[PDB]
Structure 1
Amino acid sequence: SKGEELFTGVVPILVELDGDVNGHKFSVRGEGEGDATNGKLTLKFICTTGKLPVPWPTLVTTLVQCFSRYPDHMKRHDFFKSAMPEGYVQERTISFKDDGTYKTRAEVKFEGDTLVNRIELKGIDFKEDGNILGHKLEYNFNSHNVYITADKQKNGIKANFKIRHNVEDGSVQLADHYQQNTPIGDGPVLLPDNHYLSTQSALSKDPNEKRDHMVLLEFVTAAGITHH
C-alpha cells in the first residue's frame, strides 16, 4: 500500500557519483526531475572536475529504475516500489568487451522528498590508448532492455542486461551489466518474477554553458507478463 504511493507526482533528483578510474578521480552531479506515472526522467549532468578522459556515453548507463512506468497489472511485481521510503542499495558490475571493468556501489532512497542518489565507482583494467575510453566511440544511444529476476537469497532481485555502443566506424562494444538489488529494511517487499524492461533515451547539449555538460531525457517502462 505505502511503497507505491511515494511516486504520486513529480520528484526532484540529485545524483552524485564519485569514481576512480586508473588514477582519474572524478565527481559528477546531475540535476533534474522524474515521474513514475509515465516512466519519464529528464536530467542534466555536469562534471565540476574539468575535462574527463572517458566519453560521456560511458557515464550514461551508470547514472533510478524506481521511476519506470509500471502498469496496474504488474502492481504485484514492482520490487523497487514496495520499499519506499524504505529505499534500497544496488551493487553493479559493468564489463566491457576488449577492455576492463567497473565496480559500482549505489544507495538509493528518499531524502525528505528529494531523490538523492549516492554512487561510488571503481573502474580499472583498461588500456589507456584504446577506443572504448580513448574517445573513438560515437556520441549516440540506442533502445535497450533489462532483465530483472527474483532473488530469494537476498529477498530482492538481480538485474542483468547487455548494452551495445556503436563506434564511429560501425563496430560495436557490448558491455554486460550485472547488479544485485537489496532493500535496507526487513519488511515485506513485493516479489517480481523474471521479466523485462524497455528503455529509450536521448542526449543533447545546452547551447550556452561553458562547462562540460550532458543533457538527457529518457522513457523507461517494464513488461513481461502476458496478462488478460
Structure 2
Amino acid sequence: LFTGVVPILVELDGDVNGHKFSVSGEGEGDATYGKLTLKFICTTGKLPVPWPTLVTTLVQCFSRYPDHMKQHDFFKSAMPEGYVQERTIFFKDDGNYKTRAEVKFEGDTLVNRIELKGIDFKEDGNILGHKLEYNYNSHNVYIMADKQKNGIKVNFKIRHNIEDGSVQLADHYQQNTPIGDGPVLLPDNHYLSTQCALSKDPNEKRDHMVLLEFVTAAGI
C-alpha cells in the first residue's frame, strides 16, 4: 500500500469559539522517504486560527519506519481499513481543541477526514489573535502500545514560537484505534522524529498553507 507515492486528501470541519470554518488539503505521501507534500486551503474564507495550530490535526502512516522497526508500525498495519485518530490539544493559558478523525484508503487515495471543536479561547490570545509565527519546530512524537483497545497512545508537546519572541505550548494527547477488527502491530515504546516546514505560494491569494513534512521512526 505504501511502497511508492500515494495521493492524499484531507478534509476538516472546524468550529472554534463558535467560528466555523472548513479546510481542504491535497498532495501526496512517500513512506519510503517519510515525506509529505501538501497544500491546504481554507474554503470558507479567512482561517480564524493560525495555520500552525492545525498542522498536527491535518497521516502518520506516511512515517518512514526503518526496516529494523517495521514490526512497530501500527499506522500502516491498520491499513487499508484504517484507524480513528482522536486528540485533545491544550494551548497553555488559552483554549483547547478536541478532534476526531478517520484515516483510511478511499480508492487509491489515503484520506484524512477530521472534525475539530475549539473552546475557551481568549479573544486576544495567541490563537484567535493570530500572534504565532508562520513556522514550525521539530518534535518527537512518543508512541506507546494501548494493548487494551488494540491501538496506541501518543503524547507530545508542540512549541509554537510567538511573534513577540516567547513560546506558546500545545500539549497533545492522542489515541489511535483500528477501524478493522483484525490484528494490528502493537509497538514497543518509540517515537517519530517529525519535522514540518511551512510556506506560501506568492501567486495564491486564498488563505492557505503549503506544507512539507519529514518523519522517521526512532527510539529502538
TM-score by length of 1: 0.94
Are 2:151 and 2:176, in contact at CA under 8 Å, matched by a contact in 1? yes
Two-structure CA RMSD over aligned residues (Å): 1.0
Are 2:85 and 2:102, in contact at CA under 8 Å, matched by a contact in 1? yes
Per-residue deviation at 1:60? 1.6
1:46-66 per-position Cα deviation (integer Å, ceiling 9, x unaligned)? 011111221111122221000
| Paired position in structure 1 for 2:116 | 121
Give the structure with higher Rg (CA): 1
Q: State the alpha-carbon separation in 2 of the partners of residues 190 and 153 from structure 1.
A: 13
Secondary structure class of the residue paired with 2:68: coil
Per-residue deviation at 1:191? 1.2
1:82-102 per-position Cα deviation (integer Å, ceiling 9, x unaligned)? 122121111111111010111
Are 1:132 and 1:173, in contact at CA under 8 Å, matched by a contact in 2? no
Q: State the alpha-carbon separation in 1 of the partners of residues 109 and 192 from structure 2.
A: 24
Q: State the alpha-carbon separation in 1 of the partners of residues 151 and 57 from structure 2.
A: 20
Secondary structure class of the residue paired with 2:88: strand
Secondary structure class of the residue paired with 1:153: helix
The farther-off stretch of 41-50 and 205-214 is 205-214
Q: State the alpha-carbon separation in 2 of the partners of residues 149 and 110 from structure 1.
A: 24
Are 1:89 and 1:181, in contact at CA under 8 Å, matched by a contact in 2? yes
Is 2:87 aligned against 1:92? yes
Q: State the alpha-carbon separation in 1 of the partners of residues 126 and 31 from structure 2.
A: 36
Of 174, 179, 199 in structure 2, the residue corresponding to residue 204 of structure 1 is: 199
Q: State the alpha-carbon separation in 2 of the partners of residues 119 and 113 from structure 1.
A: 19
1:182-203 per-position Cα deviation (integer Å, ceiling 9, x unaligned)? 0012211111011111011111
Q: State the alpha-carbon separation in 2 of the partners of residues 161 and 107 from structure 1.
A: 20
The farther-off stretch of 126-135 and 101-110 is 126-135
Q: State the alpha-carbon separation in 2 of the partners of residues 165 and 171 from structure 1.
A: 9
Gaps of 5+ in 1: 1-5
Gaps of 5+ in 2: none
% identical equivalent positions: 95
Per-residue deviation at 1:133? 2.5
Are 2:101 and 2:114, in contact at CA under 8 Å, matched by a contact in 1? yes
> How do 1:173-212 residues align onto structure 2 when only pairs under 5 Å count?
173-212=168-207
Secondary structure class of the residue paired with 1:46: strand
Q: State the alpha-carbon separation in 2 of the partners of residues 159 and 79 from structure 1.
A: 12
Per-residue deviation at 1:181? 0.4
Secondary structure class of the residue paired with 2:142: strand
Per-residue deviation at 1:34? 0.6
Are 2:65 and 2:216, in contact at CA under 8 Å, matched by a contact in 1? yes
Q: State the alpha-carbon separation in 1 of the partners of residues 69 and 51 from structure 2.
A: 34
Per-residue deviation at 1:142? 0.8
Are 2:121 and 2:127, in contact at CA under 8 Å, matched by a contact in 1? no
Aligned residue pairs total 220
Secondary structure class of the residue paired with 2:53: helix
> How do 1:78-227 residues align onto structure 2 when only pairs under 5 Å count?
78-225=73-220
